[PDB]
Structures are given as C-alpha cells and as structure tokens.
Design a protein around this nucleic acid. Sequence first.
RNA 1: ACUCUGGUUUCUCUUCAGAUCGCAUAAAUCUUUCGCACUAAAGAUUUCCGUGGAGAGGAACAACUCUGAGUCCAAUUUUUUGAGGCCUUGCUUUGGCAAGGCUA
Lengths: 111, 73, 847, 84, 74, 98, 77
Amino acid sequence: TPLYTDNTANGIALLWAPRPFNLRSGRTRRALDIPLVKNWYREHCPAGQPVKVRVSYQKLLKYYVLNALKHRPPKAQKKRYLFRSFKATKFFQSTKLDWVEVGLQVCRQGY
Amino acid sequence: SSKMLQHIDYRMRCILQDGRIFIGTFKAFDKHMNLILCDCDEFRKREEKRVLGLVLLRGENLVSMTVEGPPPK
Amino acid sequence: MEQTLPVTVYEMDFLADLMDNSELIRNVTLCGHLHHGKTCFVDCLIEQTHPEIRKRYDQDLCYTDILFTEQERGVGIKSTPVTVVLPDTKGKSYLFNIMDTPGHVNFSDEVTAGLRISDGVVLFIDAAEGVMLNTERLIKHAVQERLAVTVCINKIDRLILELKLPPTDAYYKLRHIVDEVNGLISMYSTDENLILSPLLGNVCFSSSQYSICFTLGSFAKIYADTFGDINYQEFAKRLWGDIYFNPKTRKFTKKAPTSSSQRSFVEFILEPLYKILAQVVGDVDTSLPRTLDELGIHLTKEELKLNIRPLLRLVCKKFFGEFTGFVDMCVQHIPSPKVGAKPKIEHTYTGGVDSDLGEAMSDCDPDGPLMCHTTKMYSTDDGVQFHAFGRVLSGTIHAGQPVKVLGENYTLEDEEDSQICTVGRLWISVARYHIEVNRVPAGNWVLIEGVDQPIVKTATITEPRGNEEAQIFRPLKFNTTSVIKIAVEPVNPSELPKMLDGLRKVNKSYPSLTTKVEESGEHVILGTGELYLDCVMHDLRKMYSEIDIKVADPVVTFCETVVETSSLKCFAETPNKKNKITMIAEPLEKGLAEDIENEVVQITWNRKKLGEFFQTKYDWDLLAARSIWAFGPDATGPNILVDDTLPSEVDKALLGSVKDSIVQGFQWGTREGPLCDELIRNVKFKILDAVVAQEPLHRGGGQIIPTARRVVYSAFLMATPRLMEPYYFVEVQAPADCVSAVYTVLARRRGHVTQDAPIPGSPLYTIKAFIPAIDSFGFETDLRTHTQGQAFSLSVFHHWQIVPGDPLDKSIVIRPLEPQPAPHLAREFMIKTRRRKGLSEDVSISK
Amino acid sequence: MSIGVPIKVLHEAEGHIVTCETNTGEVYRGKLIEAEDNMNCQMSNITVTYRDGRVAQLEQVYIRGSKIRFLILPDMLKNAPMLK
Amino acid sequence: KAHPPELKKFMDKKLSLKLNGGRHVQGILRGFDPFMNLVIDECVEMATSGQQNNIGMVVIRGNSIIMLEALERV
Amino acid sequence: EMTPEELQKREEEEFNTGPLSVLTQSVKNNTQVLINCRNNKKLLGRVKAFDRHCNMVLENVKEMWTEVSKPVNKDRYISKMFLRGDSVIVVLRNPLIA
Amino acid sequence: MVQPINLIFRYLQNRSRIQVWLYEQVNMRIEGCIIGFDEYMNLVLDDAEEIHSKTKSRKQLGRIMLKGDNITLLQSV
RNA sequence: ACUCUGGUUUCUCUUCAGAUCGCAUAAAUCUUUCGCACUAAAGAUUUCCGUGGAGAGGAACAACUCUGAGUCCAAUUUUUUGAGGCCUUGCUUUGGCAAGGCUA
Ligand SMILES: Nc1nc2c(ncn2[C@@H]2O[C@H](COP(=O)(O)OP(=O)(O)OP(=O)(O)O)[C@@H](O)[C@H]2O)c(=O)[nH]1
C-alpha cells in the first residue's frame, strides 16, 4: 500500500473544514434554514470600517444572542398537515407549473 | 469439538492413570485435554473424600470421564 | 456488593478478590501538562472495561471531569480516582488504582495529593507540543517524592493528521521528546536507574482520541499474532534506535543496508500507522475495504458509513484492541504496594522506617495494625458531609469499625488533636459511581465516611486501644506557594456564621487553600492564581454557603528584607532593666535563603556538619559557622540567627539559659515583621552582646521574649528595609507572528522577557518571561485578546524580588486612585497594606 | 483458536498460592511466580510433601511442565473473566 | 513455536535436579534449549547410596527432568 | 520438515520401500500376522488397513495371554477389531512353514 | 551461555569417554566414545559397554545407536 | 466451504417526543419590571413555519453484498507410550485392593 495517495492531502484538509464540509453524510436542510453569513458577523468587529458597519455587526450579534438565549423547546404535538387535508377534499387538485406562472396566479388571486 | 462443550458445567468424575477419581464441576478444556474442574473432590480407594477445589490437571494423566450430576444453580 | 452498578467486562467479585493480593495492585497517578490527553485515557479505558458506557460520536465523555465547572470549562480542576481491573498483554489481570490529576499549573496541589498515595507516575506528553512547563515541574516533583516515572507520549496522531511530518521526522520528534525527558530526570535525580526509553518499555505511544495505545512489545505481539513464528519479546528489542532491518539477510543490523534504508521503528511501526490513517481519511470509498481486508478487520456496512473521525476511532480500536501496552508498562516499571511500601514509609512517615510501627507498615501486611493515610476530601453534591479518601498502608479498615483519627498537629506528647470517630461506610471509588464494600485490605484506596469531622487537610486513621506509639504522616509539601490574596465579607453581616462555615468547607476541599482571619477582622483567602481563586469562590458562593459574599480586589503577599548592615548596634532591655540584648541585622549571602528553604541545610544536623557546610559554601569561619541558633520563623525559614558574643565578654553557660528564649523571640519577630506584618526574608541577625540577669526569677518567660522581638524589629529597621514582590514565571506558546504582540503585552506590566525559542517540529514559539505577581491580573486575558486567542500563557510563582522604591520615605505623596510610578511603588505597597491590616498609618522608626 | 483456556487460567494463577503434584507423587505448595504456555511452573516458598509424608521447606522450585499430573488453583480464579 | 523455558533467573546458579528413576543431581547451570535439555558444570552425582560423585561438564535430556531447584538464592 | 508439499504420497512409499511395507504385504497378500503388544499379550490375525501411526484394523483374531498359580496361557477369540499403533512392541508376518 | 546440542558437538570433537544413563533404568548405564548426534539426540557410540549397579558386569556391545528417547544424561570418563 | 430471515423506494394514517425535537429561529396574548415600550428585559401560555421515533395500511422493483442464524500434528511439552513382571504386611468382597521393597 503506498504511503500517500493523490487524494490524501485533500482528505486530511477535510478534517478541519467547517461544518458541513467535515461530514460525509447528513440530512438535507431547508433552503431558508441555511444562514450563509451567520459566521461572518460572529467574528470580531472589523477595525477601520466606518461606525455604521461596526454598529451593524454589534446589532446583528445582539439578536443572535437573544435568539440563542430566548430559545424554547419545540412543543410536542400530533402530525397534522394542512395541504394533505386540502388534497383529501374534492375542492383541490394538483398539477406542476412553472414558478413564474404560479407567482402571477397568486398576484391576481390576492388582487 | 462440540462433543465436550455440551458437557460443560456438568458435575463430572474423571478417571486418572493411577486409579484416582476426580469428581467436580467441568469448566474448561483444551486441545491437549487439560481440564478445569471447580469445587472438585478426589475419591481414592478405603473410601475417603478430599476436598480440593479448582484443579487444572494435565492431559497426560486423564483417562476417562463421566457425568455424575446435573449442573447446579 | 449489593449495589446497582454498570456492567463490566470483568465481575466485581474478581475485583474484590484482587484487592487482597497486594502483588496484583498498581497505584498509579496520571499527570502531565494542561490538555495533554490525561482524561480520555481514563474513559479510553473505562469504555474498554464497560461495554455500555461509550463516548458520544461528536462529544467526548470525560467521565472524570464529573464536576459542573469541570464540564463547562473543560479544564481538570479536581483529582478523580478510578479503580478498574485491566488485562495484561499475556492475559493476566491486575487491579489498577488510577489518579487522574488536573494539568493546569494552578492546581498542582491536587497533583501532590495524588502523588502522596501513589507508587508510580505516568507522565503524559503531547507529541506535537512536546515538553511544556508543567511537564518539567511534575517531573521534578515526581522524582523528588521518590516515585517510579514512566512516560506516555500521547496525541501521536497530531504528527500525522495535523503536522503531516514524514515518518522519519516523526521518529526524530519522538526521540527528541524522550531525550528531553531523560535530561530533565537526570537533572533532578542522581541515580541512573530511571532511564526512560521505549526499548526498556518505559515509554508508550498513544492517541486517546482514536483509541491507539501501544508499546514496542504490544506492537510486536500484534505481529506475532498475525505471523505466529516470531518471538515478540526479542522482536521488540530491535524496534527502536538506529537499528535497521536487512530484508535480504532477514536480520537487524546497527548499520543501514546500503542507502535509503529506514530505521526499524519507521519501517515496522510508524509506516503501517501512517498508512492506516492515510487510507481511512483519504481513500475511505476507494481503497479502504481492501486494506481492512489485509489487516484482517471486517467492518459492517452501516459501520463503514460513519464519519471520518468515528471511523478512524473504530478502525484503530479493531486493529490495536485493548490498552495492553499501558498495563505492561505499569506492571513492569511501577512497584506494587508491597514492594513500594518501604520508600513510602521512608519518605512520608514521621517515625522513619526504623520505627517498630514503621517496620509493620513497610511489610504492607493486611493483618497488622491499621494505618490509613488520607489526602483528599470529596464532598457529596449536597455539600453537607465529606468523604475522606486515602490508601490503607497497613492493617484492614472495616465498615462500622471505630477508629482514632490523628490530625496534623498530633504528636506523641500532645495527644489532644486525635479524636475517636466511627466509620460509616466504605466505597471503592470509581470516577462516577461508588461501589460500596464492607472492608478494604492494605495497599488499596478507600472512600471513608464518618471521619470527615475532625480533619482539615490530611489525617492518619489508626485503631483505638492499640497502636499507642502511632505518629502521623508528614503534611503535603506543595510545589508552589499561595501568593494571590483576596478578602471576603458577607453582604448581610447577620449571616457571617454561614460564610465562616463555607470557608471551613472550602478549606477542607482545596488542599493548598489557606483561609486566615487578620487582626482587623478581615477574612483572607490565599490562592495560586486567578482560575484557582475563581473556582474557589464559585464553590464558596454556590456549593457550601448559599449566601452572597463580597470579594475584594486581588492582592499579593509581600515579604520584608534589608540591603545593608544596621548603622548603630541596636539594644533592648527587659522591663526589669536587668537583661539586655544587642543585635545587628545584615543581608544574607546570595543563594543561601533558597538553600535553607529547600532543606539543603537543617538545624537538625550536628554542629560539625553545619559548620563545615557553611565554611565550604559561603566563606564562614568555624566560630560563626557553628554559631547558628535558629533558622528563621520556621525550622526552614529564610532567616538565620547567629551569636557573636565572645566567651570572655559574656559567660556562655549563662547565655545558654536565654538562648532558648532569644530563638523564640526571633522566630516570632520574623513571623510578624515590623513593616506591614509580612514575613521577613533573606536577613541575617547577629547578636553582639546579651547581658543576662543571674537571677532566674527575672529572666525567662514573658519578660525576655518581648525584649527579643523588639530588638529584632529595631535591628531590622536600622538597615534599610525593603519590600519584596512575588515574581511569576510565564510560559507563552504562540505562533511566530504573534511573538511581537506577546512582547508588547508583556512590556506594559513590568514584564521582562528572558527568552523566546522555536518549538522543534512545531510551527509555534515558546516565550518565557518574568512578571511581577501584582502586575499580572488579567495578563492572560490581555494576551489572549490582543492575539485573537492565538497565544496562551500559564504563570507560576518563581521567586521574590525587591520592589523598586523605599518603603520608609514620607516624602512621597500618593493619590488614592492612580497607578504609581516605579520610583515609589514600595511606599504605596507598604502603607496600603498597613491600612488593609488595620495597623497605624505609618511605622515609628526608633530603638 | 490457538491457546487453550486452561493455560490462560494457569497464567492467571501467578502470584497466588498453588499446590503441585508431580508424577513422582510429590506435593509442592507455594507461591506461583511464573508459568508458560506449557505447564513449566516457576514457584516459590514450597511446603513439599513426599510420598511417605515427609514435609520439607524449599524456597525456589522450577517444575517441568510435562511432569505435572494436576494443579490445584485458588478458588477466587473461579471468578476470572476468562472462566465466563 | 517451541518457546525456550525461562531459566535465565537460574543462570550460573547452583541447582539440585531430581530424575525419573528416583535419581537426583546437583550442579550449576550453564545453558538450556527449548526442550530444556540441561547442561551442568561441577556436576555431582550423589546417588541414593549416599556418596557424592563429581563429574563436571554434563548434559541431560529434558524428558527425564522432574523438577529444578536453585539451592543458592536467586 | 523439508518436504511440505501438498501432494504428499511419500507415506505409501514408506508402505512400499520403508519398514512399514511389511504390514502392507499382509494387506495385499493376506497372510496371518502375529502381534506382540505392551500388556505382555500376543495377537494373531489379518490386517486390512493402517497408516504411519501403525494403528490397524484386523479380522478373525486370536489373542493369548498368560496368568499366574503359575503362568498358564489362555486364549479368547475376537471377530473384528482395531489396535492402536503405539500399544505394540513388535509386528510379525507369520513364517513360511510349507 | 552454552547450548546442549553444541555440547554433544564438542563431545564428538573430543571423542571423550561419554557415558549415558537410561530412561527409568537406573541400574543400567552405558559408556563409550561418541561420534555423532542428530536433531533428536540419537547418538552413535563407538566402543560401548553396559554397566549394571548390582551385578556390575561390563558387557561390550561394539558400535551402537542408542535412541534419543531412551537417553537421560551424558557424562564423561 | 451448503441452506432460512431481514430489503430499498414511494403515498397515506395513528401515537409519543424538553432531543440543537430545528447546527435555524417568527408572531400573538397575559403577568412583572423599570422607563415616560419597534427602537426593552424577565416569566408563562398559545398559534404558526417543519421535524424525529414507533406502529398501521397502500404500491414500485431487488431479492441473498451486507446483518445474522441454521451448518495440513508418531521421535522430549501433552493424543501414537516405559509399558509390564517378582516379594511382604492389614483386610480377603479368596477376585484381589492399599503401601513399601524390587526386576526390567
Ligand atoms: N488530536 C488529539 N486531540 C486529543 C487526543 N486526546 C485528547 N484530545 C483532545 O485534547 C483535549 C484534551 O482534553 P483532556 O484530555 O480532557 O485534558 P487533560 O489531559 O485531562 O488535561 P486537563 O484539562 O488539565 O484535565 C480535548 O480537546 C481532547 O478531546 C488525541 O489523541 N489527539
């Protein structure tokens, strides 16, 4: 067995990658549940930026801490889904449309 | 060798080369047939019982063995 | 027995029957630098002896950092004993009493408490970091306490996964670590029989995160189990050093066959491990099953789906198995309680081995007189009752057996400190669950209930109605000195008794805690550092006393000294105006005070050896060299009392009548000190004329002692008094770029950098510097914040140095809330300390 | 698959008190120091009883493994993990 | 697989070696083999007749060895 | 052993040119064979199969042994049996009387 | 450290008057001049003579090949 | 080394879940606290976005990889022999047993 392969240096660098890049399997998340900049404002306030930027950093951190602190356990319940109930009745039907068409339909319906 | 794993924990009397009788609880055995017998007693002939305990006998002197008592609790 | 316990690989009946055979017991303490891997090892072993207790996939179950603050801080704070039955390489089982000790430099007292009741030491060293500050300190402490020393080079995976060194350079790094340890041991010890080398089995290599632990013998045994026909013991003797394998001749030579030939350790041990780790972390999907087939490991399908770290742990666990190399090390090179009893009695027993009780204790015979020594006190979570913990050096302790408990002041003539108590229960201590037992023979560690009432720090438990000539074991000699001082006071003065009770309880918990009540009614706690006092106050406010306690600003303890000889020879007379003493004070020679405190010299020596030592070491004539009366406030205080009274001027026989009182007066005077009620250090007191009243009714008792104390004070005050700061020794590890930032942080706090140097084989640097203790509060936080957390420092007390200013100078004006310039720091340190103590605002320099 | 359980049990007996009966009918009771895969026993502090019944004291003894009839082990070894 | 029996503690050591046919032999050990066949320096016969007979350099089959005792302290 | 080859038929070359070929003779030519065994007993019969251990199976055998009184040799008949190899002293093909 | 098989080797080098006991036969000893051994310590003895202890009749056997399973201990002269 | 389970995917239904049930983080109501309540904190309840576990039913293709289970050793150290024969005493269950002395 050779000491190192062509994917040994890269495979070690994955040990220290930030989550989820240190994983090799996992459960899919919703698109809106992934904050892409949450680890940006958790860093130190950047010196040299104008005062508005630093105040924005601190204000983001404030709501982050409040969310983490005021967090409450998700209550136990019984699975009841609205859209399954809608499809069960005879008043609704299913199809597959372009997103833009559905956006236009929702706009007109709300109007 | 299942023919003796079936006999484990059974109260076994083994006959020795010199005529010695060893009654005790069969615990373990190996390929050379060295026997592990716990709370073992030896019966010699004039009747007399000498309580010994945990005996590891070499396969050399072991001759013949027989179940005498069911496994205890 | 009869206690619901986690199921073990062994059975507790075997454990109980092992305790009787003192040749199968190993009393081991795990020690090392901070965060050097000492705790997984315990679970890394608990798991292997507890099928159901496993470590979480994403979180390590410390299982011995059982405390709250231990679990959040992730820092070892208190020693946790573990008693497990561990199999050997040959399949034999031994009972192991393991002391998991904290690695933080502030909590060294827990390490000494563990060292007292242990026969051997397993020093843990990070493979990447190397030998750090606490590793050297613990090596010194262990070889001084006469303990067998072994080394476990933990975290070897960092050489592979983090640093990615070539296997040969990893071998160089390991050899360099071993050589550094050997050099330290030879520095602190004279006899050679403590050579550490993996050829002797002294050194183990391990990576607790990935369940790797092997000596040379255990790896050779892996080879032998795979290929039957090799003798692993002789194989292991060729697996280290500059010995190369020649595959053509199938023999190991001291010369490398041709070129590009690797040493035996690299070829047979380091390269396979490198390849295993590389395969697991790089080719888990491609070429892992094939290599696992080659090694004979078969992993199930859902097992191959694990993340890389759990998969590596699992693969290495399958390949290596149990930690038999560690047990081999500790069985071969750590004495059993029966064999190690004699040095233990020689060192830690006041009666000496020669004593009749000393002999029976040195036999470690469990049918002899009871002699149990307790050094740790563990509090139940309710915080009301404590449980003493210690080893039974002789006899056998029973549950319900009345016992005689001896304190630390108990002597064979002052038998008032002893107290009869009744043992309630006995637990074989494991990290989390206590296994209750009915009796504990000699050579074992036992948790005792019912003897906690009359003991503060340590005790010796014997039997009533026998063992009349039973003395005590020496109180623990700690590595450091408690210097950082804080004052406490309840918010509501009504609940003062509650805070006093809490103070007693914390004094019981922390071995080196010193709680005292000053003259001004001020309660003072002495600690080693900021973390130490933080955790002490956390326990005090939340665990033992449920009241609110105010905390004063941290301050240090000072010492008083002189810098020349007294101008005019002082004199002081008794109120009878008959007895008169004349003394002068001069500074001691350089390096003599340290000799005195470190017991290089003892007044227990005959006058001949004292005289010859002083003559050959500090240019003292025989007259003065044999003239020593006392040795400072204690038996080893840094001050000396010398009589220069001529035989013609004063009759020496009459002087002998007042020698025994002048000694006491001088000891008390040095204990208090005239400046700010602090200890006197590095001062030599010479008596010049001692006029003695012939009538014994005039001298002796309460007339000559105060005169001696007053003359000591006055003689001290003529020669220019100075204050002394405690100086801290800081070691900082930081990357190359942050070294300048470390310099900048140090420069602001009167810091003086001694040396910076690279860490061989690591990308970091070590900066060693000296900082005044008082100019050190928040230094760790300043360093870790200015460097964005990339620099970390541990500080430990080193020595005493003179404050720049002159304490006795009224010309200096100090404002209440401004930092003072160095030219007059001493004046502030003196007057503010006097105000804190409640004394007058200034001294009255006089005769 | 290679080394039998009884040899392992004998390995466990090291350090305890053991009584040894060789084919010459000689009984050796003493502290078992070491044992090998074969019954070669290095054992100490021997109270030795001959066939006639004479008792002697002999501090160091090394018995060839081929020449042991049986070995009586201490009862606490009945709790060895290897006997489960 | 024939591991050498552990007699290094009994090296250079005066020993009494009893035999199969009630014979007994004394001398100092100088080496062995995995079959424990035993070499003796300054060997003394001292048969059951009660008279000690000295030989010197001798080598014994291990198959007839019953029991090995170190007369001198090891 | 210097010959660890799997296709090992040297044991029957022992049964053709070696000392054990004597009993293979009685296997092929079927003559009465006399056996002297360790209990001071003698066995006469016909051998059918055996191996390197010299343990063999016989048929229609007469065994005689003497008992002291003073030594009188008794005889008992056994139809078919099997002797362990190590329990023998000598093996004899009965001589040609003609 | 000195290895039995090698001792047979020098015994055949010296052609010493090697005497060998017998397994369990205390009465009968054999003397002779050794020539060779093997991995099983079977020996060839040139001028061999049986020695008893009760009759003590020295009977010459010529050259012999005493089995290694029967030897007990080799003595010189 | 020969045979018998277990599959995976998808849709629906039922129950439990204080587990970062969710590596994310809304809204409403009530109470308390001080300001003087988007620019504010605490406690509690509720609703929403949407989960895991188990169980049940439906329907689409894989069926023995995996998880299991049932299915070459005669020469010292053990299993390819130092075995058997003679003498005395106590008791003979008159077969001989027990110990010792022997010969091989
Ligand atoms: N890379 C690596 N990290 C390890 C290894 N073993 C432990 N660690 C980690 O290093 C840190 C050491 O923590 P502990 O092992 O609890 O520390 P300790 O040695 O007990 O020392 P104290 O904190 O003084 O109690 C933790 O983050 C461990 O998870 C190892 O083998 N390799």
